[PDB]
Write an enzyme that holds these catalytic residues in place. Structure first.
Site, mmCIF file in Angstrom:
data_model
loop_
_atom_site.group_PDB
_atom_site.id
_atom_site.type_symbol
_atom_site.label_atom_id
_atom_site.label_comp_id
_atom_site.label_asym_id
_atom_site.label_seq_id
_atom_site.Cartn_x
_atom_site.Cartn_y
_atom_site.Cartn_z
ATOM 1 N N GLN A 15 0.821 -1.211 0.000
ATOM 2 C CA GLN A 15 0.000 0.000 0.000
ATOM 3 C C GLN A 15 0.853 1.259 0.000
ATOM 4 O O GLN A 15 0.467 2.267 -0.603
ATOM 5 C CB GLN A 15 -0.971 0.067 1.186
ATOM 6 C CG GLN A 15 -2.114 -0.938 1.204
ATOM 7 C CD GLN A 15 -1.823 -2.150 2.050
ATOM 8 O OE1 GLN A 15 -0.968 -2.107 2.932
ATOM 9 N NE2 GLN A 15 -2.545 -3.235 1.806
ATOM 10 N N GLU A 173 3.804 -9.611 17.413
ATOM 11 C CA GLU A 173 4.622 -8.537 16.860
ATOM 12 C C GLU A 173 5.942 -8.295 17.596
ATOM 13 O O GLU A 173 6.945 -8.042 16.908
ATOM 14 C CB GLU A 173 3.747 -7.274 16.783
ATOM 15 C CG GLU A 173 4.456 -5.941 16.835
ATOM 16 C CD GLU A 173 3.475 -4.785 16.748
ATOM 17 O OE1 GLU A 173 2.396 -4.963 16.140
ATOM 18 O OE2 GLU A 173 3.768 -3.705 17.300
ATOM 19 N N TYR A 214 -5.411 4.228 6.011
ATOM 20 C CA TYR A 214 -4.033 4.030 5.559
ATOM 21 C C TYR A 214 -3.738 4.689 4.221
ATOM 22 O O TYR A 214 -2.569 4.963 3.940
ATOM 23 C CB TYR A 214 -3.674 2.545 5.452
ATOM 24 C CG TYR A 214 -3.577 1.793 6.756
ATOM 25 C CD1 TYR A 214 -3.502 2.462 7.970
ATOM 26 C CD2 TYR A 214 -3.515 0.408 6.768
ATOM 27 C CE1 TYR A 214 -3.399 1.769 9.163
ATOM 28 C CE2 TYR A 214 -3.413 -0.296 7.953
ATOM 29 C CZ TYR A 214 -3.354 0.389 9.148
ATOM 30 O OH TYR A 214 -3.250 -0.306 10.331
ATOM 31 N N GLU A 244 25.696 9.689 0.091
ATOM 32 C CA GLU A 244 26.081 10.758 1.006
ATOM 33 C C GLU A 244 25.383 10.639 2.356
ATOM 34 O O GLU A 244 26.044 10.604 3.397
ATOM 35 C CB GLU A 244 25.792 12.127 0.388
ATOM 36 C CG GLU A 244 26.646 12.466 -0.818
ATOM 37 C CD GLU A 244 26.319 13.825 -1.401
ATOM 38 O OE1 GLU A 244 25.343 14.447 -0.938
ATOM 39 O OE2 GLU A 244 27.042 14.274 -2.317
HETATM 40 N N1 LIG Z 1 1.093 3.146 8.282
HETATM 41 C C1 LIG Z 1 0.710 2.139 7.505
HETATM 42 N N2 LIG Z 1 0.896 0.843 7.929
HETATM 43 C C2 LIG Z 1 0.517 -0.188 7.148
HETATM 44 C C3 LIG Z 1 -0.064 0.046 5.920
HETATM 45 N N3 LIG Z 1 -0.342 -1.146 5.360
HETATM 46 C C4 LIG Z 1 0.050 -2.120 6.206
HETATM 47 N N4 LIG Z 1 0.578 -1.541 7.318
HETATM 48 C C5 LIG Z 1 1.131 -2.222 8.490
HETATM 49 O O1 LIG Z 1 1.377 -3.588 8.244
HETATM 50 C C6 LIG Z 1 1.288 -4.295 9.463
HETATM 51 C C7 LIG Z 1 0.607 -5.641 9.268
HETATM 52 O O2 LIG Z 1 1.485 -6.633 8.785
HETATM 53 P P1 LIG Z 1 1.392 -7.096 7.248
HETATM 54 O O3 LIG Z 1 1.917 -6.018 6.332
HETATM 55 O O4 LIG Z 1 -0.042 -7.453 6.938
HETATM 56 O O5 LIG Z 1 2.298 -8.420 7.174
HETATM 57 P P2 LIG Z 1 3.126 -8.832 5.862
HETATM 58 O O6 LIG Z 1 4.565 -8.393 5.985
HETATM 59 O O7 LIG Z 1 2.494 -8.279 4.611
HETATM 60 O O8 LIG Z 1 3.026 -10.434 5.885
HETATM 61 P P3 LIG Z 1 1.601 -11.159 5.730
HETATM 62 O O9 LIG Z 1 0.672 -10.728 6.836
HETATM 63 O O10 LIG Z 1 1.784 -12.656 5.787
HETATM 64 O O11 LIG Z 1 1.016 -10.759 4.400
HETATM 65 C C8 LIG Z 1 0.434 -3.445 10.380
HETATM 66 O O12 LIG Z 1 1.188 -3.055 11.499
HETATM 67 C C9 LIG Z 1 0.072 -2.227 9.570
HETATM 68 O O13 LIG Z 1 0.130 -1.062 10.352
HETATM 69 C C10 LIG Z 1 -0.258 1.343 5.487
HETATM 70 O O14 LIG Z 1 -0.770 1.551 4.393
HETATM 71 N N5 LIG Z 1 0.130 2.393 6.282
#
Ligand SMILES: Nc1nc2c(ncn2[C@@H]2O[C@H](COP(=O)(O)OP(=O)(O)OP(=O)(O)O)[C@@H](O)[C@H]2O)c(=O)[nH]1
Ligand SMILES: Nc1nc2c(ncn2[C@@H]2O[C@H](COP(=O)(O)OP(=O)(O)O)[C@@H](O)[C@H]2O)c(=O)[nH]1
Ligand SMILES: Nc1nc2c(ncn2[C@@H]2O[C@H](COP(=O)(O)OP(=O)(O)O)[C@@H](O)[C@H]2O)c(=O)[nH]1
Ligand SMILES: [Mg+2]
EC number: 3.6.5.-
Lengths: 427, 158, 427, 160, 160, 426
Positions: A15, A173, A214, A244
């Protein structure tokens, strides 16, 4: 002639990366197809006029990738650049380091080599991933383990979704974050960090938006990167290269965890009454309410501050404001970095996306800054990781998927050693 | 006037439903091309779409999408007739009615049809396969809708 | 791609699974014939998650429906969706188990399951990589439990590296429907702990309250009561078939949720509930939904949360909303209700977001949670089984059928040791 | 024109059937020429086909395939009889109707008809048979069907 | 003349009621734009506002405000027609009536309309909303009312 | 942005509270269906004080209605505006308490109030800055009295820093409608003194007197007396919801009229009441109102200022008016009526002016009083309770429900020591 390669891991990298290259085609004047109605820095070109972006997106669970495959920018990207996985890693570092991480890594390593052959000259790697993610923490870790083996001295950066202290979208986490701050400690040259609880507090008081999602978090985080690597994209009075500011911000091979803070996070109605002087754009940067990561500077000491400006900025008041910035005793600095400010000036001003929740500004400012205020941010997270291991929770998946239980004990010692490094530096 | 607006709103709602179900129409066209084995010949006629629906379409959802496209064409023809029934004559109105009738004819060469903003169906689909065959079928609806809107604006001005 | 087959057993299971598919065919928009007529291409994309493609534009549901008494499956083919299911997928036995665990497992068990296993393995290997299993059996009926537990036992052995999720019906005192519920549930739950990854427990009695108290339903037949059970199960796997701003699956749920392999008993809640007379009288927002979430009236089991601590809490949200609100209103409920969650696991709440809401609704909310108050759902069965065994009640069936009385005492002792495991982490 | 359109699909289907039975038809005309001893005359006359069927037919398979071809001719004649009355008239439409009637008339030679690229029925035969022997008979059907599609295109083009 | 003056007085009372419910109209427009996701394209037509009320209006008060605005526009159009129905018209009166018809045209672009003193309708909205979002829709009432009053004064200034 | 939860208990409180929500809808233009039809944006600006928000333009009242006898709430929901409230706030018990205070405090209502706590908790947590609870009840009916005075005592323990405005009809000498109402008085006001901040003592005889003398209405049933009652509760918050020249919220009034915790009993009033034959003969001015507020006739108590002294008086105006005559006429009556006020409190009158008038009247005024005529009203209650307890009569319904006679004598001590302390400052 120079090129840059952006690697995005996990749906947290998806995203963000969907918006990161959304602004990039909006800046240069590029249609979503990849043709126009300085572009060779990131984008590559086809002889028929079409443009193929030199980027790779990786995920394992395709229904977030499936948005890209039939998106508005569907034709913008490349078909075989966006590698589709089979099954999600699901918050398990042992999933993405011994079973899943070992299938599509060689397919990832093959596509980069196909892109590196196109790269007659490459500057470095911009890696985007998440600490709490499943793919972004597992598959990044053994990729950086394998990318460092393949490439000797190329530049390496990081933009991480750092765990906010209060808000949370995951439970194991802390285990993923501890297992990421071990492997990336050894090899990542730099690690820029953001956390969501800062952004919700930022999106409330500054953009005057009651209900952010998001996508609004994508647009603010995505424009930070654009102003970071605008200097290579557009000419300026004092350009900053990727080689740099990885060197001007890293004091030690272990202390490589900077921050970010953006200004002006300002809305359409608000900026029509608030002037944007050269002083006021950078004075808001050191105000803690604009800080892009939830920690306070009052227990912190700054180590280095790389600043990047864009647009109509006169270099006179750049120094006059930083001189005024250095005047106040409330800002703390260590006694062994008095001349530790960096200035980068870029000619092209930032542009606003159609229907932008920000303001269309004449001038801008970014700060990529290391400090010792972040040591308190892991002064809670280490206590979190020691808490669950005392009752040995959540171990039983990690043992069976390949990693050792002793890696929990070993990576704890590296967690305290990094914290012990922050204390002696911050005296 | 009012009945023309009602028919225009019905056509717009059905076209919005078709835009939501746009990918199934692409799958229907791909299945029809695979069944007819006419990969070289591009789909450029409403009669070609009808023949592919009648002979080279087997899926129920594909047949439903083709029936929706044919119903859209029938609605465009009926609205063109109702415009003549409602209005008497003007130069711009007569030219627009001739263009609408020619575009709604089943033998219209649709390969030269390319829609404009805000019809982002071309951006949603792939313009390689669309520039081969699918682009005219994708863009026939939007240019006709824009022409209908222009004729409604001219009728309001008159 | 990744795939879950659905499993039904007994008279209770087949009535739920018939109603369970009445909503997921509605969400994907499927006629009783088997031909898609939805108004969204996103439904067609991940439509192979539950279905199998078939010629003529048909889609055959893939479920294994098993019953030794053929009375139920006739009503399945007499249901509204009786003409859509596969006729080869129906396996019927000669004589029913007759509300006996002993008749359903050893005597009349093997003569049907191997004909059943000809159906499962044909469907399971037909995919590329299967994701897991989803079975509806009840702990009160002998045909559902003992035959179903034997299906649990061996398909686990056939595919060892695979997740299994079960939605089981736990009994209640005031809705006592089988004399040997202290026998049959005891003889079922003892083998579920060892050999099932995820267990979901539903109790009938609170559902009789919910149709009266929450929705104010006047004439609640089993069509109403199964429907609230049916739509709850659909939200568990909603990201498997639809995209989301934060995608997750069953084993994403598992990793965050289960601290140990032997403590995996949950409680579900479905909650956008609003009575028919209040449709114009309520606002649909996350302050309402979070308040509606942890209310005691909306758990689907005869339990009370205040008699224990929630170990972890997961939630699969669904609908278009603002990502801050869940990230906020799951935070202060960890703050204000400080003692109602554990203290040795930080960031207990697990959150996820799906895009597409169900038809006829704006936003939806689903709850899955493990609580330490669940031991009354086990010690009641433990104290009743001691009440059974002390006067040697009803043992005469099991003595002549080959069951050793030591098997009861082995089942008694190990489930008596397990209730301390929920108890010891409480204190 | 619903009956016309149903006739259009029926004529298309029997054209596909005829082209599927193309190879037997050439041998049918071959032994017809052998029995009639008119090897010099090129087969392009509908009345010649009528007389050859009525006299020099010895097998039921040949009897059936000549039935099929002449049934195609007769139903196309009826379709032309509807087309001459269904339309009002432009010079182009009058040219189309005159060409259709002139081709479907039995009194006209059809030796000057050779099919274009969309119909590949010419190339399926042997050299002299496709060039001079049966070229007019083979290309009669594509010319009539091409006139059919051209008339559909023109009637859809013209505003009434 | 007299009925036209009575219609103008009724329109003045209706515009006073609309000004009393002016913030409701702005909230209705904001809700319709948020529901239709047209946050970039401004509403430039009374027909566009009617379509937004038809498709994207869910609040009852918002629907009432939109219906009142559309009914006030319909009454203004009826008065514009009644001016020609009543008076023969001078040349400047014909120019003013043509301006009234162009302004009350549903397909006309109203994004270029801005009010002046003493009409504080522009000051009743924000500067960005008046400049690019809803200034013409807010200020359509005052210029049209001034045009109607000027037409009434011109009709009074005509000799007998 | 400030909110008030309107608790509504007891049949008198239900019937009075039914008209309360009827007028604030009429001042804001809300139909019985619930579709907004306000013709001005001014009440759109400040509506979240009393209404809540539902999807589609439905503005739901924030009213909790609890009563032990189901007969009233059917007539409440069958009323002219009963089709809009919260069914989930409606929590009806089956057995009416039977005008016994101990029934509402130990026996049947004591189980019901736990459900009442959940309901008010549902309404409370939906906000961010709540003023407090406006509960409408009556002292005469022991179902409203026994349960209600338990509610103030329970909310006070739960919520220490809020405001507690209670509108209760005090027992009356001549419209005595319950034989055990002197018992229901003493057992209830004992809780009204300790743990209640704003208490409004309404006496129906003046309400009977006003419709007889000032209005001379031939057939004003309970639908008409409650209309005069319902206006006064709006004047309590007429500056809270209607912005204007001078604004004052609840506790601005509550701190100001209350010197000590023993002195908080407020006589209310409304002031533009006019006889039907004399609208055209009466000139609408502020000096016309000056006689009308400090008329003894227009108070809502069967009390005489002749009997007691004013300590603090609050009269909020309502309309478009100058500030000169408001101060100038109050300068006139503070001069002439100096004996009524105590000599040791100057600037007795608090005047606040709201600009927005009620519909159908260009101007309005609302009266609040804090006199020492309430001491004899409570003294007459005390002696009658003293005579009844001397014979120890009627106590078998009370003592037979487990509660002891020690609570009677302490309240009898607490009743007299409420008004004995009134004498010292008099
Ligand atoms: N700030 C922000 N955080 C995001 C966004 N999209 C995902 N996240 C973060 O992604 C985390 C969730 O983990 P995932 O990205 O779903 O895990 P992954 O690395 O893709 O691995 P899988 O879950 O197996 O697909 C959360 O803490 C979200 O906050 C976003 O668009 N903006
Ligand atoms: N919620 C729900 N429970 C059911 C339904 N059908 C049966 N049951 C429960 O199933 C239990 C009996 O199951 P039973 O028919 O004996 O199972 P079997 O003998 O193995 O087929 C009873 O306690 C019922 O409450 C249903 O449709 N919905
Ligand atoms: N002002 C007013 N008083 C009322 C009304 N209806 C009843 N009352 C008074 O209520 C008192 C009795 O209280 P009651 O209704 O029994 O309270 P409950 O026991 O809680 O139901 C009587 O003295 C009546 O004078 C009304 O409509 N207006
Ligand atoms: Mg992910």
């Amino acid at each position: 002639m120079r090129e840059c390669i952006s690697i995005h891991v996990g749906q947290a990298g998806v995203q963000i990366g969907n918006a990161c290259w959304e602004l990039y085609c909006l800046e240069h004047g590029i249609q979503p197809d990849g043709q126009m109605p300085s572009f060779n820095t990131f984008f590559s070109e086809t002889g028929a006029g079409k443009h193929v972006p030199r980027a790779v997106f990786v995920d394992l669970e395709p229904t977030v990738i499936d948005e890209v495959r039939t998106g508005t920018y569907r034709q913008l990207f490349h078909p075989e650049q966006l590698i589709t996985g089979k099954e999600d890693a699901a918050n398990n570092y042992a999933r993405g380091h011994y079973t899943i991480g070992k299938e599509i890594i060689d397919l990832v390593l093959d596509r980069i080599r196909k892109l590196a052959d196109q790269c007659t000259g490459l500057q470095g790697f911009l890696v985007f991933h998440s600490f709490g993610g499943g793919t972004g923490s597992g598959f990044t870790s053994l990729l950086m383990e394998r990318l460092s083996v393949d490439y000797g001295k190329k530049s390496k950066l990081e933009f991480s979704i750092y765990p906010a202290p209060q808000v949370s979208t995951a439970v194991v986490e802390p285990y993923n974050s501890i297992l990421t701050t071990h492997t990336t400690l050894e090899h990542s040259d730099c690690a820029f960090m953001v956390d969501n609880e800062a952004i919700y507090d930022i999106c409330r008081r500054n953009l005057d938006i009651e209900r952010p999602t998001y996508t609004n978090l994508n647009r603010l985080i995505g424009q930070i990167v654009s102003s970071i690597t605008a200097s290579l994209r557009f000419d300026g009075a004092l350009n900053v290269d990727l080689t740099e500011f990885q060197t001007n911000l890293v004091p030690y091979p272990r202390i490589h965890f900077p921050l970010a803070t953006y200004a002006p996070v300002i809305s359409a109605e608000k900026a029509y009454h608030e002037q944007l002087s050269v002083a006021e754009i950078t004075n808001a940067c050191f105000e803690p309410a604009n800080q892009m990561v939830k920690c306070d500077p009052r227990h912190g000491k700054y180590m280095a501050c790389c600043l990047l400006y864009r647009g109509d900025v006169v270099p006179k008041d750049v120094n006059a404001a930083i001189a005024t910035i250095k005047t106040k005793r409330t800002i703390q600095f260590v006694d062994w970095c008095p001349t530790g400010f960096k200035v980068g000036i870029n000619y092209q001003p930032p542009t606003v996306v159609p229907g932008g929740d920000l303001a269309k500004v004449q001038r801008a400012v970014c700060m990529l800054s290391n400090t010792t205020a972040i040591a308190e941010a892991w002064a809670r997270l280490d206590h979190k990781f020691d808490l669950m291991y005392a009752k040995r929770a959540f171990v039983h998946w990690y043992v069976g998927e390949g990693m050792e239980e002793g890696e929990f004990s070993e990576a704890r010692e590296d967690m305290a050693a990094l914290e012990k490094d922050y204390e002696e530096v911050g005296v | 006037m009012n009945e023309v607006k009602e028919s225009l709103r019905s056509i717009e709602q059905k076209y919005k439903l078709f835009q939501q179900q746009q990918l199934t129409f692409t799958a229907a066209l791909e299945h029809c091309r695979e069944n007819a084995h006419d990969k070289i010949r591009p789909i450029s006629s409403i009669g070609q779409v009808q023949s592919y629906m009648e002979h080279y379409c087997n899926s129920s959802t594909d047949r439903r999408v083709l029936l929706m496209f044919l119903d859209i064409c029938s609605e465009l023809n009926k609205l063109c007739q109702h415009f003549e029934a409602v209005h008497s004559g003007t130069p711009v109105t007569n030219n627009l009615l001739e263009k609408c009738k020619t575009l709604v004819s089943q033998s219209n060469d649709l390969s030269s049809l390319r829609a404009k903003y805000p019809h982002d169906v071309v951006n949603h689909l792939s313009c390689d396969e669309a520039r081969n065959h699918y682009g005219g079928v994708v863009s026939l609806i939007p240019l006709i809708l824009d022409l209908m809107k222009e004729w409604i604006a001219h009728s309001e001005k008159l | 791609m990744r795939e879950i087959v659905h499993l039904q057993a007994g008279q209770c299971g087949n009535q739920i699974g018939a109603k369970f598919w009445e909503v997921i065919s509605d969400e994907h928009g499927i006629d009783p014939t088997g031909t898609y007529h939805g108004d969204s291409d996103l439904q067609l994309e991940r439509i192979n998650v539950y279905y199998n493609e078939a010629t003529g534009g048909k889609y055959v549901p893939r479920a294994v429906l098993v019953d030794l008494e053929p009375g139920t499956m006739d009503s399945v083919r007499s249901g509204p969706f009786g003409q859509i299911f596969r006729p080869d997928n129906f396996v019927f036995g000669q004589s029913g188990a007759g509300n006996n665990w002993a008749k359903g497992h050893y005597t009349e068990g093997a003569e049907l399951v191997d004909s059943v296993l000809d159906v499962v393995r044909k469907e399971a290997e037909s995919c590329d990589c299967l994701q897991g299993f989803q079975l509806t059996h009840s702990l009160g009926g002998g045909t559902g439990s003992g035959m179903g537990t034997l299906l649990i036992s061996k398909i686990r052995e056939e595919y060892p590296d695979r997740i299994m999720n079960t939605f089981s019906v736990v009994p209640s005192p005031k809705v006592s429907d089988t004399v040997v519920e202290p026998y049959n549930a005891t003889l079922s739950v003892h083998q579920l702990v060892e050999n099932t990854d995820e267990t979901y427990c539903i109790d009938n009695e609170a559902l009789y309250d919910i149709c009266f108290r929450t929705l104010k339903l006047t004439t609640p037949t089993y069509g109403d009561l199964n429907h609230l059970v049916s739509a709850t199960m659909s939200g568990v796997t909603t990201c498997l078939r639809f995209p989301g701003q934060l995608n997750a699956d069953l084993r994403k749920l598992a990793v965050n949720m289960v601290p140990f392999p032997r403590l995996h008993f949950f409680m579900p809640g479905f909650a956008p509930l609003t009575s028919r007379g209040s449709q114009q009288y309520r606002a649909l927002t996350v302050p309402e939904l979070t308040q509606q979430m942890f209310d005691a009236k909306n758990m689907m089991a005869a339990c009370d949360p205040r008699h224990g601590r929630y170990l972890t809490v997961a939630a699969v949200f669904r609908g278009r909303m603002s990502m801050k609100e869940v990230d906020e209103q799951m935070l202060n409920v960890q703050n204000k209700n400080s003692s109602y969650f554990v203290e040795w696991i930080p960031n207990n709440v697990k959150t996820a977001v799906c895009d597409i809401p169900p038809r006829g609704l704006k936003m939806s909310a689903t709850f899955i949670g493990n609580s330490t108050a669940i031991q009354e759902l086990f010690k009641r069965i433990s104290e009743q089984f001691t009440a059974m065994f002390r006067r040697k009640a009803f043992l005469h069936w099991y003595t002549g059928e080959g069951m050793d009385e030591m098997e009861f005492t082995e089942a008694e002792s190990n489930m008596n040791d397990l209730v301390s495991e929920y108890q010891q982490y409480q204190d």
